[PDB]
Amino acid sequence: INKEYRLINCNTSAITQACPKVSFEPIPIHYCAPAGF
Amino acid sequence: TLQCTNVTRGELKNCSFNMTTELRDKKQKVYSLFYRLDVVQINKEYRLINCNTSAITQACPKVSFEPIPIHYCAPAGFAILKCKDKKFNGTGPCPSVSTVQCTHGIKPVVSTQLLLNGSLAEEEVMIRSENITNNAKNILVQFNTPVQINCTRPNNNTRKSIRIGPGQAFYATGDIIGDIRQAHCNVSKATWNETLGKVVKQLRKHFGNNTIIRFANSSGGDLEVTTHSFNCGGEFFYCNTSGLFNSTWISNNDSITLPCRIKQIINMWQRIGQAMYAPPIQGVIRCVSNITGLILTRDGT
Amino acid sequence: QVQLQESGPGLVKPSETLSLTCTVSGGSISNYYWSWIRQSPGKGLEWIGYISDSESTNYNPSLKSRVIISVDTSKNQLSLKLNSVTAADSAIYYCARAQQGKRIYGMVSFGEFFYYYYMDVWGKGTTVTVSSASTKGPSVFPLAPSGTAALGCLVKDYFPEPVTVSWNSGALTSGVHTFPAVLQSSGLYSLSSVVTVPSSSLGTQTYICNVNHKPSNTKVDKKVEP
Amino acid sequence: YVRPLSVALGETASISCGRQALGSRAVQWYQHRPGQAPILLIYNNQDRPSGIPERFSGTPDINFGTRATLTISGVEAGDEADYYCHMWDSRSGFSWSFGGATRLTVLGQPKAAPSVTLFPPSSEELQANKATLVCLISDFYPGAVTVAWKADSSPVKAGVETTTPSKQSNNKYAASSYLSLTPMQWKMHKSYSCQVTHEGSTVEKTVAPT
Ligand SMILES: *[C@@H]1O[C@H](CO)[C@@H](O[C@@H]2O[C@H](CO)[C@@H](O[C@@H]3O[C@H](CO[C@H]4O[C@H](CO[C@H]5O[C@H](CO)[C@@H](O)[C@H](O)[C@@H]5O[C@H]5O[C@H](CO)[C@@H](O)[C@H](O)[C@@H]5O)[C@@H](O)[C@H](O[C@H]5O[C@H](CO)[C@@H](O)[C@H](O)[C@@H]5O)[C@@H]4O)[C@@H](O)[C@H](O[C@H]4O[C@H](CO)[C@@H](O)[C@H](O)[C@@H]4O[C@H]4O[C@H](CO)[C@@H](O)[C@H](O)[C@@H]4O[C@H]4O[C@H](CO)[C@@H](O)[C@H](O)[C@@H]4O)[C@@H]3O)[C@H](O)[C@H]2NC(C)=O)[C@H](O)[C@H]1NC(C)=O
Ligand SMILES: *[C@@H]1O[C@H](CO)[C@@H](O[C@@H]2O[C@H](CO)[C@@H](O[C@@H]3O[C@H](CO[C@H]4O[C@H](CO)[C@@H](O)[C@H](O)[C@@H]4O)[C@@H](O)[C@H](O[C@H]4O[C@H](CO)[C@@H](O)[C@H](O)[C@@H]4O)[C@@H]3O)[C@H](O)[C@H]2NC(C)=O)[C@H](O)[C@H]1NC(C)=O
Ligand SMILES: *[C@@H]1O[C@H](CO)[C@@H](O[C@@H]2O[C@H](CO)[C@@H](O[C@@H]3O[C@H](CO[C@H]4O[C@H](CO)[C@@H](O)[C@H](O)[C@@H]4O)[C@@H](O)[C@H](O)[C@@H]3O)[C@H](O)[C@H]2NC(C)=O)[C@H](O)[C@H]1NC(C)=O
Ligand SMILES: *[C@@H]1O[C@H](CO)[C@@H](O[C@@H]2O[C@H](CO)[C@@H](O)[C@H](O)[C@H]2NC(C)=O)[C@H](O)[C@H]1NC(C)=O
Ligand SMILES: *[C@@H]1O[C@H](CO)[C@@H](O[C@@H]2O[C@H](CO)[C@@H](O)[C@H](O)[C@H]2NC(C)=O)[C@H](O)[C@H]1NC(C)=O
Ligand SMILES: *[C@@H]1O[C@H](CO)[C@@H](O[C@@H]2O[C@H](CO)[C@@H](O)[C@H](O)[C@H]2NC(C)=O)[C@H](O)[C@H]1NC(C)=O
Ligand SMILES: *[C@@H]1O[C@H](CO)[C@@H](O[C@@H]2O[C@H](CO)[C@@H](O)[C@H](O)[C@H]2NC(C)=O)[C@H](O)[C@H]1NC(C)=O
Ligand SMILES: *[C@@H]1O[C@H](CO)[C@@H](O[C@@H]2O[C@H](CO)[C@@H](O)[C@H](O)[C@H]2NC(C)=O)[C@H](O)[C@H]1NC(C)=O
Ligand SMILES: *[C@@H]1O[C@H](CO)[C@@H](O[C@@H]2O[C@H](CO)[C@@H](O)[C@H](O)[C@H]2NC(C)=O)[C@H](O)[C@H]1NC(C)=O
Ligand SMILES: *[C@@H]1O[C@H](CO)[C@@H](O[C@@H]2O[C@H](CO)[C@@H](O)[C@H](O)[C@H]2NC(C)=O)[C@H](O)[C@H]1NC(C)=O
Ligand SMILES: *[C@@H]1O[C@H](CO)[C@@H](O)[C@H](O)[C@H]1NC(C)=O
Ligand SMILES: *[C@@H]1O[C@H](CO)[C@@H](O)[C@H](O)[C@H]1NC(C)=O
Ligand SMILES: *[C@@H]1O[C@H](CO)[C@@H](O)[C@H](O)[C@H]1NC(C)=O
């Protein structure tokens, strides 16, 4: 602004803590086209 | 709790208040301008008008309150039927009919007393109601020639962003740059005289060629109905209409001025428990629109 | 056209009523706004108050509690009665005709204008001094001369300002040179006038300086000769 | 209080108003030479009265934002006075006070030297048991002089009064100077002088009792 600090996002945006059950693991995704395509 | 003062008659205020910052443990004493219709008392102490009734949501300052032509379409297997009768009143058998898939360009104009930017009537001016003898039925008269109205809030307002939280910004009225004037509207006293004369001509066809037709102002209600309530450039006007409906007609440059007030805390409809703060508009607001219809209410000489 | 001339005591004791008058010439008194303005030494032009063509009172709130501007239409004369005077009230008081301007910026119907007043013609001024000291007339002492020559008159101890000096009752006006006063440590001003004069006419033409000091009602003259 | 401003002879003067307006304004400009009647220069933001040179011009408010300034082109030496800005506008109430006295001083004026004239005590006041030397100084510029009295060759410094340099109608300055003496002090001396140092040079004028 002991020394005084602050979260980097406070002057720009709100912050949402990621749910600690979901995983950031790349799971193989398959993109499929609908019927007729 | 707001600490408000008059601004250097006595309509728009200048209020200051302790406000939360972007840090949850820091306050700030910021100030802002509010119209009279948005505040009530308890330096004098004030408060937003909605606080004892409802929560308030500030409208996103990127969306526009501009009536865009909307087309209503029927799904496949259905159809819409138009009416090509240039003198078609509300009900009855339309002689000339045609089918369409979508309606024409309909501008969702939220108005009051005066139908703004609407579609005209071909041939002569029409007048409609369910039972014109029933005085509790609003008469929906639609002009054939538009009488032009010019409205403006001439105050050069300024918008002030106020960080009220992480990513939360309250847009406030900073201060007025220059003159402080009155918001009003103009109609041509000539084009409004002949338009009232055409309306008064069709009013005798079911009321009597000898009885007198008189025009008066509203007799009570809320601000949204007792005044010409509409939107102009993004701010909600409320225009006194006593200068338009003050004429008594017998069996046989000009300019009218309507003193409009401006409000920011508005319940759009009759919504209970919901309020909206319209953010202030920078610059000098002026909008040019046609009044093409009218919503009357006879008394019941 | 229109010209004004003030007049008054010139000296008023502290804690009293400072009377003042101003007669206008060449115009009707009851169709113009009139304003009083004073200018103290060191301070700026201070607006006392003003009276309308409808004879309405409105004073500067800095004073007000001491001002009462009157007006008699039998003559072209209006007054000004500042009372409870103190030391800071010493100033040159001016008599100016204020004209009304209606500055319209929006709609005249809603009242979107404001009135501004401007003074165009002014009075010459009247010096007012506040002091418990009594008045005192001066005493003219002649200054004798000796191509070109110069002679004048010494106007010793007097109080208060001002004194008017005329030469030959008003005939001698070219080459005249009256100097500003000098406040002595005793508390009295000493002024001196002087007239530059061609040398040949020193022994022929006669010169008489006419000194007047209004707070003492004194009119005195004197001759100058080598 | 006073705001200093300096322009050169024959240039353009830009007297900015002290209080800038909040809304639509009606500014009156006044010229005031101290010890004299104020002179109205411009009453409506741009309108001047009858008898004001064209070189005086005030800025009108056609668009808001443009501040009111007094413009004096080709400034003369006589345009040395206090200039007030009487500011009315729609937002402020009733402006009772005038502006802040801008004291415009013109630079580059002709440097003129004084004119000393020393008179001896008159016979009447000498017969009244009081002597008075008067040393009249006039027509000097810049208006600031230092006076030195001398009994014979010795400095006096005791019992002398001197005017502050007041301005003349010819835009030059003048100041008196009186030395009070006893009728015997003035008789017991051979001569009396009035050294008048203006700028960087002195001017002597001596007077003896004969
Ligand atoms: C909806 O409907 C509404 C209502 O129906 C409608 O409202 C209207 O809004 C407009 C805009 O908002 C308003 O227009 C304003 O009008 C003001 C008043 O104008 C009138 O009065 C002045 C002054 O009159 C005095 O002086 C003249 C001589 O100059 C005399 O002849 C008069 O008789 C009168 O003098 C007597 O009366 C005095 C009392 O007032 C006494 O005190 C006095 O002793 C005398 O007895 C006139 O000049 C005007 O004349 C003009 O109008 C005629 C038609 O009538 C035109 O043909 C012609 O163009 C004339 O010029 C008029 O009669 C104006 O002051 C105002 O304009 C000024 O203000 C704005 C903002 O402040 C400035 O930006 C602008 O530039 C103007 O400033 C100039 O003037 C001021 C004041 O003098 C100066 O200080 C300033 O420096 C500047 O001077 C510059 O311009 C001058 C020329 O203008 C020039 O001479 C200078 O040299 C310099 O360059 C503005 O125009 C209108 O009033 C509303 N209507 C009503 C009824 O109130 C609305 O528009 C409608 N539409 C919507 C909302 O969309
Ligand atoms: C709505 O209400 C708010 C109040 O909550 C108003 O905001 C205040 O407005 C006033 C003016 O009306 C402001 O006062 C001005 O402050 C200026 C800032 O100067 C400060 O900082 C300097 C350091 O640089 C200090 O030295 C100084 O002392 C101040 O603390 C000043 O420049 C102004 O001075 C002017 O006035 C004085 C005396 O009147 C003159 O002598 C000066 O020459 C000069 O002309 C003045 O003091 C105040 O700061 C505002 N407050 C905030 C929090 O912003 C809104 O204006 C008002 N809006 C409307 C539309 O009514
Ligand atoms: C009834 O209909 C009228 C027209 O159909 C409406 O008038 C419109 O009002 C809106 C808002 O008040 C205006 O939008 C504003 O536009 C200006 C700039 O516009 C100017 O510049 C553009 C350049 O891109 C140019 O194309 C335009 O022609 C203008 O010259 C912006 O500054 C504003 O932020 C805002 O976007 C419309 O411009 C205006 N249209 C017309 C034709 O005047 C009126 O509001 C309607 N009334 C009601 C009650 O709904
Ligand atoms: C929020 O604060 C950050 C502080 O890091 C600002 O980012 C810095 O801004 C300064 C000057 O504005 C720059 O010199 C730095 O280079 C910036 N650093 C980074 C990492 O961006 C940021 O601008 C602020 N945001 C807002 C909206 O005020
Ligand atoms: C703003 O100005 C109005 C107009 O003068 C004030 O209204 C007055 O309010 C007091 C109560 O405090 C009443 O006694 C008066 O009768 C009211 N006068 C009028 C003409 O309505 C109002 O109080 C002012 N508000 C502020 C905050 O100064
Ligand atoms: C919230 O407060 C407002 C204050 O304006 C209340 O509305 C006023 O209520 C009083 C008495 O109840 C009436 O005399 C006024 O005519 C009302 N004014 C308006 C504009 O409605 C409102 O009733 C309060 N609401 C609740 C739920 O308490
Ligand atoms: C207000 O007035 C008329 C409608 O009565 C519109 O102007 C006319 O619009 C039609 C079709 O849009 C054109 O054929 C005419 O040539 C127009 N006339 C003129 C003189 O321009 C105008 O667009 C209407 N404004 C609205 C509905 O917002
Ligand atoms: C309304 O006021 C704003 C200022 O609050 C004006 O914006 C200025 O416009 C000029 C151009 O004429 C720019 O040079 C300035 O930098 C602008 N100022 C700001 C703060 O942006 C605007 O012109 C005014 N509009 C009207 C109609 O009065
Ligand atoms: C409403 O505003 C419009 C435009 O601002 C006015 O139409 C103008 O009228 C003048 C005078 O007849 C013409 O010189 C202009 O060319 C018109 N503008 C356009 C775009 O055509 C109209 O008169 C105003 N009406 C009222 C009642 O105020
Ligand atoms: C709309 O305007 C009319 C006048 O144009 C206002 O009528 C005033 O009504 C009050 C009673 O409430 C009277 O005391 C006034 O004398 C009326 N004024 C005039 C000029 O007739 C009317 O009040 C306005 N509407 C609102 C809601 O204020
Ligand atoms: C803000 O809080 C302080 C705390 O004492 C109080 O004195 C002040 O009046 C408050 N300001 C406002 C505008 O409520
Ligand atoms: C519309 O016209 C029909 C026949 O012309 C008539 O029966 C009907 O009553 C009219 N509508 C109204 C509201 O009068
Ligand atoms: C209607 O007009 C009457 C008289 O003209 C007035 O007393 C009343 O306040 C007006 N009401 C509205 C809502 O304009």
Numbering used by the authors:
A (entry chain G): 184, 188 to 223
B (entry chain G): 128 to 135, 151 to 184, 188 to 309, 312 to 321, 321A, 322 to 398, 411 to 458, 465
C (entry chain H): 1 to 82, 82A, 82B, 82C, 83 to 100, 100A, 100B, 100C, ...
D (entry chain L): 7 to 67, 67A, 67B, 67C, 68 to 95, 95A, 95B, 95C, ...
Question: What does the literature reporting this entry say, word for word?
Answer:
Unlike VRC03 and VRC06, the more potent VRC01-class bNAbs such as VRC01, VRC07 and N6 appear to interact primarily, if not exclusively, with a single gp120 protomer and possess shorter FR3 loops that marginally contribute to antigen binding. Based on these premises, in the present study we rationally designed an FR3-loop grafting strategy in an attempt to confer on several potent CD4-BS bNAbs the ability to interact with additional target epitopes on a neighboring protomer of gp120. While the binding footprints of both chimeric antibodies on the first gp120 protomer are nearly identical to those of the original antibodies, the FR3 loop-contact surface is mainly located on the neighboring protomer, indicating that the elongated FR3 loop establishes quaternary contacts without affecting the “classic” interaction. Besides contacting CD4-BS2, mostly through residue K207, the FR3 loop seems to bind residues with long side chains at the base of the V3 loop: the aromatic Y318 and the positively charged R304 and R308. Mutations to alanine had generally less pronounced effects than charge inversions, suggesting a dominant role of electrostatic interactions; however, simultaneous alanine mutation of R304 and R308 yielded a pronounced loss of neutralization, particularly for chimeric N6. Thus, long-range charge interactions between R304/R308/Y318 and the negatively charged FR3 loop appear to play a critical role in the enhanced trimer interaction of chimeric antibodies. A strong association restricted to N6 was aa 276, an N-glycosylation site, where an asparagine was highly associated with improved neutralization, while an aspartic acid that impaired glycosylation had the opposite effect. Likewise, our results showed that N6, which naturally has a tyrosine at position 54, is mildly autoreactive. In particular, N6 and VRC07, which in their unaltered form were mildly reactive in the ANA test, lost all detectable reactivity after chimerization, while VRC07-523-LS, which was clearly ANA-reactive in the unaltered form, showed only mild reactivity after chimerization.
The native HIV-1 envelope (Env) spike is a heavily glycosylated trimer of gp120–gp41 heterodimers, which mediates viral attachment and entry. As the main antigenic structure presented on the virion surface, Env is the sole target of HIV-1 neutralizing antibodies. Among the gp120 supersites, the CD4-BS is the most conserved and less protected by the glycan shield, making it a primary antigenic target for vaccine development. By docking and mutagenesis studies, we previously demonstrated that certain antibodies to the CD4 supersite, such as VRC03 and VRC06, establish functionally relevant quaternary interaction with two neighboring gp120 protomers in the HIV-1 Env trimer, while others appear to make contact with a single gp120 protomer.
